[PDB]
Amino acid sequence: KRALISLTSYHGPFYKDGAKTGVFVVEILRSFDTFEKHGFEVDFVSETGGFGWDEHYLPKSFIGGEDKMNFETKNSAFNKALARIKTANEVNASDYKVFFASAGHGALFDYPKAKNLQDIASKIYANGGVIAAICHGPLLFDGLIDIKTTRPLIEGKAITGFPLEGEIALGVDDILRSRKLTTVERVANKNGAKYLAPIHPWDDYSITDGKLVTGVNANSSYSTTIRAINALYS
Amino acid sequence: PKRALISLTSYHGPFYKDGAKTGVFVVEILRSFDTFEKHGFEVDFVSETGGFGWDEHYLPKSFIGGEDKMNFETKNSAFNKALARIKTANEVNASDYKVFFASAGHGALFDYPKAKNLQDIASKIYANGGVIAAICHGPLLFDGLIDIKTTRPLIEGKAITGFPLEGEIALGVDDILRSRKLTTVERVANKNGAKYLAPIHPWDDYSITDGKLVTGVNANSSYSTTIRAINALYS
């Protein structure tokens, strides 16, 4: 039983104050821990094999509980996997039964064009596995193809993910226009899917539609991981 | 100024193996009424017959507390005044209301799929640009609910949630659904061309907004569903 968590590989500029974006560490900590407590062996991966933390969301500023210890303990299960982070094109998809797409505002840049991660995810899904994605993670769905039909994998599906209202609240909706970046909702409509919104951008909100599982944010990471595990055995 | 209509199940007869009668789950109407009122909506109640009864496994005294208890037990509270004024469905003018809210309880299994007057009110409210909301077994009212613009079932092409079969199994009433040939929300969704999206647990606060069609799983979802219903009205 193996799960594969993808990270955004982009960690360049984004924010107006010069600070760089990247991975939101809370997302992968919660997901990694939940998988491994439920009998899965987890590996990390990105399109390039590299990544960085969003600079407005530095680990020590946001991490709490026992995943704070997991991050800081150098020899932990989380750190052994993170140091072993794989490069997408080198990954054998048949090793994994669950694909989990973690995010951060970096996913706005690489995920829609991450052809190798998409290849991995679409193959896992083809063999009867689960594709899961949280926050900006569903951006990986843009260009994600059903091997059999050649149509978008998420066509006719219901998904959730980070809402436009969340970006406005964060004051980054202008950056989306400036840097020609998209939203999960746009990706949904572009690919024949329906987008379902949470009441608030910070809510723990999740959707299971067959073996395609989505969540709104890091606060939804645990629930989306549980949904992914349940979906695999459905 | 702005008015909401909360429907109750009409049925309060036999259901459980221990001889207990089913009916309304009071927490559903108490919580939705309050949330509507606190947001400036005047609220009226309705059922298909004009009558109702509390589910005997969920008697109010055994399940209410705080200002829910207060609102229920205070003789001239806004909740009690509206409940004593419960309307009969065929007498209701649909154009008065901007939101239809179907509360439930296992009683909904018996009358809701065939409550043609309630179905008429809801469709008209929907046609006039209003919102349809439903929690728990409430979405059973959607069975054969016609969109006047399409001629087809209103929930066709829509995403909904509601009380899962998993919930009936945990409650040990799933065998009663087979004996008495009663349905589930999931089965109503698939029969009317809708997609059913399940909660992780049958007791979760879980709700969906799809345009102006709003659904929740249970009483723990009634607040969130009412909020979603209000929000959807101005969408």
UniProtKB/Swiss-Prot annotation, chain A:
List, from the UniProt record, the residues annotated as the active site of this protein: 135, 136, 167
- Keywords in alphabetical order: Cytoplasm, Lyase, Stress response
Gene inactivation phenotype reads: Results in higher sensitivity to oxidative stress, reduced thermotolerance, accumulation of higher levels of reactive oxygen species, and reduced chronological life span.
Please state the Enzyme Commission number of this protein. Answer: 4.2.1.130
Q: Where, subcellularly, is it found?
A: Cytoplasm, P-body
Q: Which reaction does it catalyse?
A: methylglyoxal + H2O = (R)-lactate + H(+)
Q: Which domain of life is it from?
A: Eukaryota
InterPro entries under this entry? Class_I_gatase-like, Prot/Nucl_acid_deglycase
Q: Which residues cross the membrane?
A: none
Which residues are the signal sequence here? none
Which is a GO BP term held by this UniProt record? methylglyoxal catabolic process to D-lactate via S-lactoyl-glutathione
In the record, the note on similarity to other proteins reads: Belongs to the peptidase C56 family. HSP31-like subfamily.
Subunit organization: Homodimer.
Q: What this chain does, per the record?
A: Catalyzes the conversion of methylglyoxal (MG) to D-lactate in a single glutathione (GSH)-independent step. May play a role in detoxifying endogenously produced glyoxals. Involved in protection against reactive oxygen species (ROS). Important for viability in stationary phase. May negatively regulate TORC1 in response to nutrient limitation.
Listed name of the protein = Probable glutathione-independent glyoxalase HSP33
**Gene from which this protein is expressed:** HSP33
